[PDB]
Design a protein around this ligand. Structure first.
Ligand SMILES: Nc1ncnc2c1ncn2[C@@H]1O[C@H](COP(=O)(O)OP(=O)(O)O)[C@@H](O)[C@H]1O
Ligand SMILES: Nc1ncnc2c1ncn2[C@@H]1O[C@H](COP(=O)(O)OP(=O)(O)O)[C@@H](O)[C@H]1O
Ligand SMILES: Nc1ncnc2c1ncn2[C@@H]1O[C@H](COP(=O)(O)O)[C@@H](O)[C@H]1O
Ligand SMILES: Nc1ncnc2c1ncn2[C@@H]1O[C@H](COP(=O)(O)O)[C@@H](O)[C@H]1O
Ligand SMILES: O=P(O)(O)OC[C@H]1O[C@H](O)[C@H](O)[C@@H]1O
Ligand SMILES: O=P(O)(O)OC[C@H]1O[C@H](O)[C@H](O)[C@@H]1O
Lengths: 298, 299
């Protein structure tokens, strides 16, 4: 009623699905570039006093997708939108969230958080934030929704027994345990790479192994984890990973790996090449995100 | 002694020329991308207490070049640089500097100014800012240096008579007059288009060697339509001096097929290979001017 939704160019397919679940159309807006490539925005709706949600992951191309979101917010703010919420299902730059050992590097996730505050965004809604502590980078509320229910429901459809959940690094154990907890408290193993050489903490022999992670980027560790699980007698290996970044050699890595299937969500659209990769399959968070948007709408 | 310079990927050739004039090396820093395209920066020098200058036009790719500048500044700031100056010879997004008739548009130039303040930049140095009033978008000092001395020196080398300076639109008259006044107080004409778009000239260019002056050549529509109108109205020759060679889309081919004798541009923005192959386009360098401006603010 007060709710309006706009989208940039980052993931128009997900925006269309969210709109279908909300039963409200996508608001009209020019979001593109000038001839020279500068980001170009004009809002083509009256937004005064409206509860406005901008649907825009900051996936590749990250800086262009971020600038679209930021200057959409700037345009909406000076046009007197009542509230501006950034729905950023995949939050780019989240891995740059500290200076490891005080290295002379930026904290780009904090730069981005401050950018969003600077243009008058009032809330962030995001999925499986790489570090939930990124909530504290913001004064504004940050709703970090977990993809676990949708990934769990798809795992259930596979009708597997002897399930073992595998964390592919020591940083992903919390997310991996959250899946294992809901599968009759399934077994959990952790991949521990040293020096060069990977070690499995746990016993994968004759197990249907399911690697769980938040991001698949180059898929290098995902595929080396799958090879080592199979070399140690896994009955099968699949992966459930929220955000399909899939940069560089990722699709070829997956194609030539021992993974049965890699299931990802639609926080990031797949390239044409990834859409043609028979091992990759998408499950949707559009319903979950629509429900989250309805919960905050006022 | 206290000065350090770094550069991103926007215009390394200009950065290296400035470095050569200052006789100080470019500081070591990784400026690139992670595999997924996210901007990646690591400063590879001790910068503590140093007077640091980051050389980075925000020309195309504008958002990537801007992000490099911003997170270079963020890295330098957390590394305790003494001062951080953004040397941005071409300031991208300067044309989005108001909401025309309160349209529902961003003021992106102000978004960008606030971005620079937010990462701890202490000063901006820029060339021929599209609107000098953008200085007031900032709390920090903004030094807007004019390219005029370099363009005047080059015009003088041509040894032309019957010179007429031409503003190719009504917003360029202040810049064009500043050149005309300093060029032996030359005559001035103005191109005035009306969507009837029909061209009209204010002034008399017949039999004159006309020199179009402007800040940006982007698609070259303004430039080429002005050059055609001047030739149609009897100009003896037409050339152009335009600071920033954005040169998007069909710009180079438009210039190639125009009647322009020459288009002189600066090196605030690197030329594409196609522009480099266009005999009509010639570059004059602002490396010395920018080096001197950097020396002037160095503490
Ligand atoms: N887009 C990116 N792609 C790959 N690595 C990144 C990216 N952004 C930051 N990083 C790097 O990832 C590292 C931190 O990642 P994170 O998952 O938070 O912890 P860990 O290093 O334990 O995996 C840092 O070295 C950081 O520079
Ligand atoms: N990168 C760009 N390329 C082309 N036009 C732009 C760009 N950025 C902003 N603009 C548009 O140019 C117009 C303002 O330009 P300016 O030269 O200041 O005044 P004028 O409208 O008289 O040309 C605005 O409509 C703005 O939307
Ligand atoms: N003593 C420590 N306590 C907690 N985290 C650490 C420690 N040492 C390194 N790390 C983190 O571990 C990662 C790198 O591991 P390493 O190979 O041990 O340097 C980086 O994310 C560091 O921030
Ligand atoms: N899917 C998930 N991703 C990341 N963290 C989670 C997830 N599920 C639970 N947690 C965290 O795990 C901890 C234990 O909470 P719980 O397991 O829900 O009792 C809390 O800090 C949660 O935030
Ligand atoms: O091996 P890649 O797919 O390139 O990187 C993916 C990892 O990058 C981040 O740490 C995520 O948490 C994943 O574990
Ligand atoms: O005609 P284009 O080359 O695309 O645009 C360049 C013009 O755009 C701006 O007004 C500048 O001041 C120039 O006059």
């Amino acid at each position: 009623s007060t709710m309006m939704i706009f989208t940039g160019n980052a993931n128009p397919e997900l925006a269309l699905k969210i709109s279908s679940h909300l039963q409200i159309p996508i608001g009209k807006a020019t979001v593109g570039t000038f001839s020279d490539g500068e980001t170009m925005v004009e809002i083509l709706e009256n937004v005064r006093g409206k509860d406005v949600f901008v649907l825009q992951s900051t996936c590749a191309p990250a800086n262009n997708n971020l600038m679209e979101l930021l200057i959409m917010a700037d345009a909406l703010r000076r046009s007197s939108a009542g509230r501006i919420t950034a729905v950023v299902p995949y939050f780019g730059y989240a891995r740059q969230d500290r200076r490891v050992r005080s290295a002379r590097v930026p904290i780009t996730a904090k730069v981005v958080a401050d950018m969003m505050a600077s243009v008058g965004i009032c809330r962030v809604l995001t999925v499986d934030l790489h570090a939930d502590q990124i909530q504290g980078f913001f004064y504004m509320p940050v709703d970090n929704v977990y993809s676990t229910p949708v990934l769990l429901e798809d795992i259930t459809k596979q009708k597997l027994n002897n399930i073992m959940i595998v964390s592919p690094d020591v940083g992903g154990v919390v997310r991996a345990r959250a899946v294992a907890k809901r599968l009759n408290d399934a077994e959990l193993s952790i991949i521990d790479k040293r020096r060069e050489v990977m070690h499995i903490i746990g016993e994968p022999a004759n197990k249907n192994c399911i690697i769980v992670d938040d991001i698949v980027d180059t898929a290098g560790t995902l595929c080396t984890a799958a090879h080592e699980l199979k070399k140690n007698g896994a009955k099968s290996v699949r992966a459930y990973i929220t955000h399909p970044v899939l940069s560089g050699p990722a699709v070829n890595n997956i194609k030539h790996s021992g993974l049965d299937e890699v299931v990802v969500t639609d926080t990031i659209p797949l390239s044409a090449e990834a859409q043609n990769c028979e091992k990759i399959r998408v499950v949707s968070l559009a319903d979950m995100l629509a429900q989250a948007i309805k919960r905050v709408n006022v």
